[PDB]
């Protein structure tokens, strides 16, 4: 393989393009990189464990990995209190050590192994233009992805459960026993609108629906894996797509961009798969928490919170949603679709119930609302909490804010990468990625426009 411009036509700043047709070095690149991902997982987990104060809420402490492990049900109890520090440490150590194994294997294949795998084995050696082998690799990796989704199902059903924030008695690690196998609910989540009140798949509000979706995903991915091992692409697919390594890269780039946007919105809105005991309140959660906190405070002073008009004529504490539901007032009218385990006990069939607001508010709901309104996902880049006009004394930016911003930006730049690699794949397959040929310039043969 050429490791310079004169022998490849690619500069140093585009060097990894020198690997496109070197499958062994490409595999080593791919495997060393996986090393890196598992390395960050393990080392970041060990960092977060070392900096963790377990009696303090995770979201106060700049943690984005321990909430993921805690949502799986490890090292936590009721209300997300940390029982034991050892499962988080175990997850870190196992990733870190394995990452050493993956890094050694990538270096081998990259530096010492055969540069092309096609002269060594037909099973592992691939040509990008060989549609059967490409779909075989899709198929192997789909069976593995389905096995991973079924492993999440097995953790929730058979090996200790997941954290359910919606659990009666308070949020707790519970074992899922009746997952939603009903395909109407599971795929009607896919059919729901990506707008307010509907939320597409971001609105999944119970662990039974989540675990049932992963049974179906596991089944769908395993079936699609066998499909693609046993079959070859059909004529419409062969005539519709570009068949090259850069093309398949760009297809994956568009896919990754879509999932990055979905992940940013998921962590910004959903409090079920991202429980607020670990990630802190959502922005909608915190705004409704402030409205509830001052409803409770002024009700304790003797305000008639239902008959109180504000300055505009709308109700100061309670008002009507556009479909009529009894909701909190002020600007949080926007957030009347919010649902949370601290709030839903005060909701009736028509919305917020006057009787429950008068004589069913518990002290823990007040405590949770005060904590969530003061841990709103508002913060500066140097991690100064609250509104931006506040002074420097509160060191806090929400993990929801960090995760959402990161993945939105990642998703955008991966769309840019999709456009770049798709466009280049199209031009390279069509033969003009290196520029216009002067003799056969296509515009010089076209008629004039006017």
């Amino acid at each position: 393989g050429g490791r310079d411009l004169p022998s490849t036509g690619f500069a140093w700043w585009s060097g990894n393009a020198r690997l496109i047709n070197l499958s062994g070095k490409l595999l080593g690149a791919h495997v060393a990189h996986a090393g890196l991902i598992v390395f960050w997982a393990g080392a970041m987990t060990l960092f977060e464990v070392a900096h963790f104060i377990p009696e303090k809420p995770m979201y106060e402490q700049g943690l984005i990995l321990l909430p993921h492990i805690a949502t799986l049900g490890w090292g936590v109890g009721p209300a997300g209190e940390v029982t034991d520090i050892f499962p988080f440490f175990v997850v870190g150590v196992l990733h870190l050590i394995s990452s050493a194994v993956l890094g050694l294997g990538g270096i081998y294949h990259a530096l010492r192994g055969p540069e092309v795998l096609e002269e060594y084995s037909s099973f592992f050696g691939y040509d990008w233009k060989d549609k059967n082998q490409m779909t075989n690799i899709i198929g192997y990796h789909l069976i593995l992805l389905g096995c991973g989704a079924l492993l999440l199902v097995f953790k929730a059903m058979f090996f200790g459960g997941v954290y359910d924030t919606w659990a009666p008695g308070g949020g707790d690690v519970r074992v899922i026993t009746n997952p939603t196998l009903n395909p109407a609910i599971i795929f009607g989540y896919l059919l729901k609108a990506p707008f307010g009140g509907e939320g597409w798949i971001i609105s999944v509000n119970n662990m039974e629906d989540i675990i049932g979706g992963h049974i179906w995903i596991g089944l769908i991915c395993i079936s699609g894996g066998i499909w693609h091992i046993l079959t070859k692409p059909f004529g419409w697919a062969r005539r519709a797509l570009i068949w090259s390594g850069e093309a398949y890269l760009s297809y994956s780039l568009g896919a990754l961009s879509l999932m990055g946007f979905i992940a940013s919105v998921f962590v910004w809105f959903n409090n079920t798969a991202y429980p607020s005991e670990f990630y802190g309140p959502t922005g909608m959660e915190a705004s409704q928490s402030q409205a509830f906190t001052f409803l409770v405070r002024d009700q304790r002073l003797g305000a008639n919170i239902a008959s109180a008009q504000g300055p505009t004529g709308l109700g100061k504490y309670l008002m009507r949603s556009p479909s009529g539901e009894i909701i909190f007032g002020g600007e949080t009218m926007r957030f009347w679709d919010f649902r949370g385990p601290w709030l839903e006990p005060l909701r009736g069939p028509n919305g917020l119930d006057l009787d429950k607001l008068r004589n069913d508010i518990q002290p823990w709901q007040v405590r949770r609302a005060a904590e969530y309104m003061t841990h709103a996902p508002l913060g500066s880049l140097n991690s100064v909490g609250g509104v931006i006009t506040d002074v420097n004394s509160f060191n806090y930016v929400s993990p929801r804010a960090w995760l959402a911003t990161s993945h939105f930006v990642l998703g955008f730049f991966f769309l840019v990468g999709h456009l770049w690699h798709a466009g280049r794949a199209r031009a390279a397959a069509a033969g003009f990625e290196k520029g216009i040929d002067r003799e056969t310039e296509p515009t010089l043969f076209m008629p004039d426009l006017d």
Binding site: L5, G9, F10, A11, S14, A17, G310, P311, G330, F432, E433, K434, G435, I436, D437, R438, E441, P442, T443, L444, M446, L449
Partner: protein, 341 residues
């Protein structure tokens, strides 16, 4: 051979850094400006002129350091080191903000020296001097903003301070006190600057995507030679592309590049005219028809009236700390504020 021609020979020698006759103005003055900035932001306080820390020595960072403007009590005094305020005392000169007219005047003369350098090198090389004519835009902005605007005001205090957040303060100041967004001269500047950025992006992308295949590498950068006579990209294909995408296209490369000059330079000159207007408080602050209608009818609201309320609030809340020499005592009850904030 006379001494003038021998000196002209030495100053115009081909060397890593061209000096020229203009360098005698350019290189000390710029070194006085930039070093004067770098000294001030490292060491010099604004505690006696502004009541602010503005140096790395006081704990400020790169965003918050500045060579801040002088105290308002000096008016438009040039604040020479030997002048009647500092009287030769270097420490007092630093404390009263003499570094601001030091950097602003050495910068002015340095910018003059740079334009003279553009003219001199254009004459010696043998090209037309359109780089200097293009550089008049930045000189118009510097002269209007840093010199003419405080000269129309009470003092050098209200000039922009040579710092990041100090410039941001000046920006927000001209919003809340002058409604400078509402000024059409500024709006023409915004059009020119965003249009120049558009022209830069669109021209670079169009050239890089209509390149002729003049080489074998996927690296297309080495298929160009500076001594070649032919165009490296297709003007015809680019023109057809933009004619079918956008409706119109450039057909003349010379007009393309003159337009690329013309748009941001005209934007800078128009915004400079607006800044000269703001020097005398000749603002585009209000639409009097909408003010009279809103005064007589309290249901009428537009975005313009909302922005007027925003400016009112910023003025009242910012003025006591921003103009500490005025001793504005505004009690809490007189500050305009909406409900619950």
């Amino acid at each position: 051979r006379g001494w003038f021609d021998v000196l002209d020979d030495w100053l115009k020698r081909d060397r890593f850094v061209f000096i020229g006759w203009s360098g005698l103005l350019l290189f000390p003055c710029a070194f006085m400006a930039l070093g004067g900035w770098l000294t001030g932001t490292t060491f010099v306080t604004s505690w006696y002129t502004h009541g602010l820390a503005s140096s790395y020595l006081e704990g400020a960072n790169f965003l918050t350091v500045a060579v801040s403007s002088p105290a308002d009590a000096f008016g438009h005094s040039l604040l020479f080191l030997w002048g009647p305020e500092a009287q030769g005392n270097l420490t007092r000169w630093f404390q009263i903000g003499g570094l601001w007219p030091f950097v602003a005047l050495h910068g002015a003369f340095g910018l003059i020296g740079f334009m003279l350098r553009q003219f001199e090198i254009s004459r010696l090389v043998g090209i037309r001097p359109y780089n200097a004519i293009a550089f008049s835009g930045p000189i118009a902005v510097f002269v209007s903003v840093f010199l003419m605007y405080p000269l129309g005001q009470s003092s050098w205090f209200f000039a922009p301070s040579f710092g990041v957040a100090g410039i941001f303060r000046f920006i927000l100041f001209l919003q809340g006190f002058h409604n400078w967004t509402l000024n059409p001269f500024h709006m023409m500047g915004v059009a020119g600057i965003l249009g120049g950025a558009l022209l830069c992006a669109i021209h670079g992308a169009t050239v890089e995507n209509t390149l002729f295949e003049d080489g074998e590498d996927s690296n297309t950068f080495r298929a160009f030679e500076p001594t070649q006579a032919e165009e490296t990209y297709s003007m015809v294909t680019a023109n057809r592309f933009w004619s079918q995408i956008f409706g119109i296209a450039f057909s003349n490369k010379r007009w393309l590049h003159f337009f690329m000059l013309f748009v941001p330079v005209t934007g800078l000159w128009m915004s400079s005219v607006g800044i000269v207007g703001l020097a005398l408080n000749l603002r585009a602050y209000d639409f009097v028809s909408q003010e009279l209608r809103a005064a007589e009818d309290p249901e009428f609201e537009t975005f313009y009236t909302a922005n007027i309320l925003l400016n009112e609030g910023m003025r009242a809340w910012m003025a006591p700390q921003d103009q500490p020499h005025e001793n504005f005592i505004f009690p809490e009850e007189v500050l305009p504020r909406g409900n619950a904030l």
